[PDB]
UniProtKB/Swiss-Prot annotation, chain A:
The keyword Manganese does not apply. PROSITE patterns: RIBOSOMAL_S11. One of its GO terms (molecular function) is rRNA binding. GO terms for biological process: translation. It holds the Pfam family Ribosomal_S11. Located on the upper part of the platform of the 30S subunit, where it bridges several disparate RNA helices of the 16S rRNA. Forms part of the Shine-Dalgarno cleft in the 70S ribosome. It comes from the Bacteria. Residues 99-114 are annotated as: Disordered. Part of the 30S ribosomal subunit. Interacts with proteins S7 and S18. Binds to the C-terminus of IF-3; however exactly how IF-3 interacts with the 30S subunit is unclear. This is Small ribosomal subunit protein uS11. The gene is rpsK. Keywords: Ribonucleoprotein, Ribosomal protein, RNA-binding, rRNA-binding.
Swiss-Prot record, chain C:
Pfam families: Ribosomal_S15. Disulfide bonds: none annotated. The keyword Ribosomal protein applies. Belongs to the universal ribosomal protein uS15 family. Keywords: Ribonucleoprotein, Ribosomal protein, RNA-binding, rRNA-binding. Gene3D superfamilies: 6.10.250.3130, S15/NS1, RNA-binding. This is Small ribosomal subunit protein uS15. The keyword Mitochondrion does not apply. Part of the 30S ribosomal subunit. Forms a bridge to the 50S subunit in the 70S ribosome, contacting the 23S rRNA. InterPro entries: Ribosomal_uS15, Ribosomal_uS15_bac-type, uS15_NS1_RNA-bd_sf.
Curated annotation (Swiss-Prot), chain D:
InterPro entries: Ribosomal_bS6, Ribosomal_bS6_CS, Ribosomal_bS6_sf, Ribosomal_S6_plastid/chlpt, Transl_elong_EF1B/ribsomal_bS6. Part of the 30S ribosomal subunit. Forms a tight heterodimer with protein bS18. Belongs to the bacterial ribosomal protein bS6 family. GO terms for molecular function: small ribosomal subunit rRNA binding; structural constituent of ribosome. The gene is rpsF. SUPFAM superfamilies: Ribosomal protein S6 (SSF54995). Gene3D superfamilies: 3.30.70.60. The lineage of its organism: Bacteria, Thermotogati, Deinococcota, Deinococci, Thermales. GO terms for biological process: translation. GO terms for cellular component: cytoplasm; ribonucleoprotein complex; ribosome. This is Small ribosomal subunit protein bS6. Keywords: Ribonucleoprotein, Ribosomal protein, RNA-binding, rRNA-binding. Located on the outer edge of the platform on the body of the 30S subunit.
UniProtKB/Swiss-Prot annotation, chain E:
HAMAP family: Ribosomal_uL2_B. Residues 222-271 are annotated as: Disordered. This is Large ribosomal subunit protein uL2. GO terms for biological process: cytoplasmic translation.
Length: 114, 70, 88, 101, 271
RNA sequence: GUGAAAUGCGCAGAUACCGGGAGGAACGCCGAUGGCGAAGGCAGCCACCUGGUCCACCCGUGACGCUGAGGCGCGAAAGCGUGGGGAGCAAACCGGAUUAGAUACCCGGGUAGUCCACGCCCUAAACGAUGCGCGCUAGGUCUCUGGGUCUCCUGGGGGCCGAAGCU
């Protein structure tokens, strides 16, 4: 919420954008970022380079709150998933452990027209 | 690699409680492991699947393990 | 399914001789029994159509056996119908 | 009469006295529906996968009994009525299947 | 479900009556101090305060036991199910073993010979009444006290029923027949199950005459009056609402909530 | 959100994350070249009720068989009646985009419906586009399921390759 060294980062990989939410080890967010926050609009928010800058920026912001250690959690498939991850550990942030939690139904709700 | 059938000793596969036995079949993520790698035959593969499902319902077995470190 | 003993009760009864596990009369009664269990089952499971087909086939089979026993010996037939309170 | 293995999962975090009270209930119920008991394995507390009832653990009781099949349903209903009964699963017993002999 | 008629007369062609199949052969209500009287088309001044009423068909009033906590533990055998012209529901005359007798809204699924009882101890099943705190969440129920020891008054209409939604403090959330959600108190008794005669919503009165037997007088559209009698009273050739649709007294009648804002009762409801 | 966008949503605090709760629908992995059914069709798990079918033993009846106009029953989806249910999806409908136009393909919204009960409707690329029953005419391989001391033998299904032959 305000001051903790350990924590966790959340990758969210859409196909038209990528966001990242760093939170305390409880769940409550500290800060976040995304392709749009970075500067891009539309398709480019999907770009892997944007995703790179998102994780980077989200990291820098967390760095200030005293963040140093984070377990990464990813959901999505967008071209930027691993790039957010790669950009995370390379951000001097401690990547304790990357995890995949991308939801998927055991057959329930009918999808869109696609 | 290593067939799951031979990997274990003699065992009953209608037993929906010897989690230690069953747990070995249940993939890295709780997915009922493919027959083409459990070494099981048609009839046995079926009875297994049914008992696993039973266990999961009793809470003994998982429905989904998260993919760790990737 | 009907109790195995209850099946005997029928066979032992209708068999026109000991070990007659396959007479005409025997098959007939043996059907009539299974038919009426369906009659009631469907009497409550009205949605259960697939089983109803089965019943039609049974009722049908029971027909031939009588059609035959009727033609074969109208004496044994008269008694078997009258006994099973059958044909309405 | 038919053989059944009757599984029950109970609230883990509760005293042995009320836990005895919950068994007070199950024992009755069975008899109330003509359940001639057989060997029983009160495995007790256990660590189970998905946290049911918000709990990562639960007390297990595996009975076994011959009884009138036409009433196994009503019994299961009666069994589940309990709140501290987190789960019931009566099953038809079957001849075990030797695998990888 | 419902008895219908061959169209040997018009109106008879649509008219349908309820099959009183359930009503266990018992025309005469339990005279035993059970019926009273009624009548009265208007208020205590001579004035009419409810339009278009009066005509009915002379009914003794069946005395119903809406509290029922007055006989805790005492069980009773349902002697019969009777017709009650005073309600949408059917009543059930039950003989308490105590020797005493009483009426009760016959819940759907109740049948004669059945035993039944009230109290906290009572087994959860149709007919049995007991404090909500003891009713297993999720169970449907009817004849619900709004406040403890004040008498049942929720879900008494035919086929209506409330369902428990969960506990919370001394109160217990439940969905009313209206779909409304609200906390009712714990010590509020309530008899298990839904109310009887559910196919009641299907009867086709069939003719104006029948409405009269129910005591309903012909109701006259304000559009068909004069400016003096009603807002809509423009009358001047099957004309449209002068706007916007109003009551005979002039309050808008399409939308426009009437329930008081600051009612302290508000605190206990949820949508 | 897309080809890119726009409509839309969001400082009245949305998206992303966590906790508690409500409700409907559909059943991941097992799952397939698989299985069952007369067809339409049938997939989480449990119990009950029930149909068809296959193998063994050589036990029983003794041709009781086949087909079957009309009759009767079943009959995907959509659709209809009464009442209930309504999360997702979504004809119609509204808006955005594209275009010469776009009453469409794409996008943002969205109703009947899709779900349940009872009752109608009775159609289809209801397709193997191949009526049912029986007997007879090389084999090779693959698989599902029964019986038997069992690198195999013998029934019952599901595919492929192919004698003769047919076309
Ligand atoms: Mg762009
Ligand atoms: Mg894009
Ligand atoms: Mg759409
Ligand atoms: Mg797999
Ligand atoms: Mg039966
Ligand atoms: Mg159904
Ligand atoms: Mg002859
Ligand atoms: Mg007659
Ligand atoms: Mg008759
Ligand atoms: Mg539950
Ligand atoms: Mg009479
Ligand atoms: Mg009377
Ligand atoms: Mg008195
Ligand atoms: Mg008097
Ligand atoms: Mg009075
Ligand atoms: Mg009045
Ligand atoms: Mg007066
Ligand atoms: Mg007076
Ligand atoms: Mg009150
Ligand atoms: Mg009433
Ligand atoms: Mg108080
Ligand atoms: Mg109506
Ligand atoms: Mg009436
Ligand atoms: Mg009117
Ligand atoms: Mg009028
Ligand atoms: Mg006046
Ligand atoms: Mg006047
Ligand atoms: Mg006017
Ligand atoms: Mg006038
Ligand atoms: Mg006007
Ligand atoms: Mg209006
Ligand atoms: Mg007012
Ligand atoms: Mg008010
Ligand atoms: Mg533009
Ligand atoms: Mg929108
Ligand atoms: Mg502001
Ligand atoms: Mg949650
Ligand atoms: Mg939540
Ligand atoms: Mg809550
Ligand atoms: Mg809802
Ligand atoms: Mg739910
Ligand atoms: Mg539901
Ligand atoms: Mg379904
Ligand atoms: Mg598959
Ligand atoms: Mg494969
Ligand atoms: Mg298939
Ligand atoms: Mg089917
Ligand atoms: Mg079905
Ligand atoms: Mg049944
Ligand atoms: Mg079967
Ligand atoms: Mg069979
Ligand atoms: Mg021989
Ligand atoms: Mg022979
Ligand atoms: Mg023999
Ligand atoms: Mg002979
Ligand atoms: Mg012979
Ligand atoms: Mg023939
Ligand atoms: Mg013929
Ligand atoms: Mg013809
Ligand atoms: Mg025909
Ligand atoms: Mg019909
Ligand atoms: Mg269907
Ligand atoms: Mg339909
Ligand atoms: Mg439709
Ligand atoms: Mg109409
Ligand atoms: Mg409807
Ligand atoms: Mg519902
Ligand atoms: Mg509705
Ligand atoms: Mg809906
Ligand atoms: Mg939509
Ligand atoms: Mg519109
Ligand atoms: Mg606009
Ligand atoms: Mg349009
Ligand atoms: Mg063009
Ligand atoms: Mg134009
Ligand atoms: Mg249009
Ligand atoms: Mg809609
Ligand atoms: Mg229409
Ligand atoms: Mg369904
Ligand atoms: Mg339903
Ligand atoms: Mg329903
Ligand atoms: Mg009709
Ligand atoms: Mg149809
Ligand atoms: Mg045709
Ligand atoms: Mg086809
Ligand atoms: Mg053919
Ligand atoms: Mg053929
Ligand atoms: Mg050969
Ligand atoms: Mg080969
Ligand atoms: Mg074999
Ligand atoms: Mg041999
Ligand atoms: Mg077949
Ligand atoms: Mg197949
Ligand atoms: Mg072959
Ligand atoms: Mg050739």
């Amino acid at each position: 919420k305000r001051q903790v060294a350990s924590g966790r980062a959340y990758i969210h990989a859409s196909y038209n954008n990528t966001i990242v939410t760093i939170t305390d080890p409880d769940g409550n967010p500290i800060t976040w970022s995304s392709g749009g926050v970075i500067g891009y609009k539309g398709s480019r928010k999907g770009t892997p380079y944007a995703a790179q800058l998102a994780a980077l920026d989200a990291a820098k912001k967390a760095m200030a709150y005293g963040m140093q250690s984070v377990d990464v959690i990813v959901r999505g498939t967008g071209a930027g998933r691993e790039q957010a991850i790669r950009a995370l550990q390379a951000s001097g942030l401690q990547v304790k452990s990357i995890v995949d939690d991308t939801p998927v139904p055991h057959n329930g709700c009918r999808p869109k027209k696609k | 690699k290593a067939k799951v059938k031979a990997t274990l000793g003699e065992f009953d596969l209608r037993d929906y409680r010897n989690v230690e036995v069953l747990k070995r079949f249940l993939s890295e993520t709780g997915k009922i492991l493919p027959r083409r790698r459990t070494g099981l035959s048609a009839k046995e593969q079926r009875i297994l699947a049914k008992t696993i499902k039973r266990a999961r319902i009793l809470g003994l077995l998982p429905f989904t393990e998260k993919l760790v470190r990737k | 399914p009907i109790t195995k003993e209850e099946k005997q009760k029928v066979i032992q009864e209708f068999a026109r001789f000991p070990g007659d596990t396959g007479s005409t009369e025997v098959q007939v009664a043996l059907l009539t029994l299974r038919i009426n269990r369906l009659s009631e089952h469907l009497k409550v499971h009205k949605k259960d159509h697939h089983s109803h087909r089965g019943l039609l086939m049974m009722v049908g089979q029971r027909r031939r056996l009588l059609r035959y026993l009727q033609r074969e010996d109208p004496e044994r037939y008269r008694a078997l119908i009258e006994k099973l309170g059958i044909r309405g | 009469m038919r053989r059944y293995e009757v599984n029950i999962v109970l609230n883990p975090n509760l005293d042995q006295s009320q836990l005895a009270l919950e068994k007070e209930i199950i024992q009755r119920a069975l008899e109330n529906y003509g359940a001639r008991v057989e060997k029983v394995e009160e495995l007790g507390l256990r660590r189970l996968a998905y946290p049911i009832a918000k709990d990562p653990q639960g007390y297990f009781l595996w009975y076994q009994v011959e009884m009138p099949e036409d009433r196994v349903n009503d019994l299961a209903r009666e069994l589940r009525i309990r709140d501290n009964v987190r789960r019931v699963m009566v099953v038809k017993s079957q001849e075990p299947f030797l695998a990888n002999a | 479900a419902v008895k219908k008629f061959k169209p040997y007369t018009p109106s008879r062609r649509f008219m349908t009556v309820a099959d009183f199949s359930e009503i266990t052969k018992t025309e005469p209500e339990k005279s035993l101090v059970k019926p009273l009287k009624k009548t009265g088309g208007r208020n205590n001044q001579g004035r009419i305060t409810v339009r278009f009423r009066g005509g009915g068909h002379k009914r003794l009033y069946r005395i119903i036991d809406f509290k029922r906590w007055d006989k805790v533990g005492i069980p009773a055998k349902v002697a019969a199910i009777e017709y009650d012209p005073n309600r949408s529901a059917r009543i059930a005359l039950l003989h308490y073993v105590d020797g005493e007798k009483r009426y009760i809204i016959a819940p759907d699924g109740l049948q004669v010979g059945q035993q039944v009882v009230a109290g906290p101890d009572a087994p959860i099943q149709v007919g049995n009444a007991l404090p909500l705190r003891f009713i297993p969440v999720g169970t449907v129920v009817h004849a619900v006290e709004l406040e403890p020891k004040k008498g049942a008054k929720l879900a008494r209409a035919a086929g209506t029923s409330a369902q428990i939604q969960g506990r919370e403090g001394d109160y217990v959330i439940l969905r009313l027949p209206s779909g409304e959600l609200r906390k009712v108190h714990g010590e509020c008794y309530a008899t298990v199950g839904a109310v009887g005669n559910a196919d009641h919503k299907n009867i086709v009165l069939g003719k104006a005459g029948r409405s009269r037997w129910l005591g309903r007088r012909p109701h006259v559209r304000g559009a068909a009056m004069n400016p003096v009698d009603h807002p809509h009273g423009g009358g001047e050739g099957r004309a449209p609402r002068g706007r916007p649709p109003a009551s005979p007294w002039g309050w808008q009648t399409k939308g426009l909530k009437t329930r008081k804002r600051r009612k302290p009762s508000s605190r206990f409801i949820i949508a």
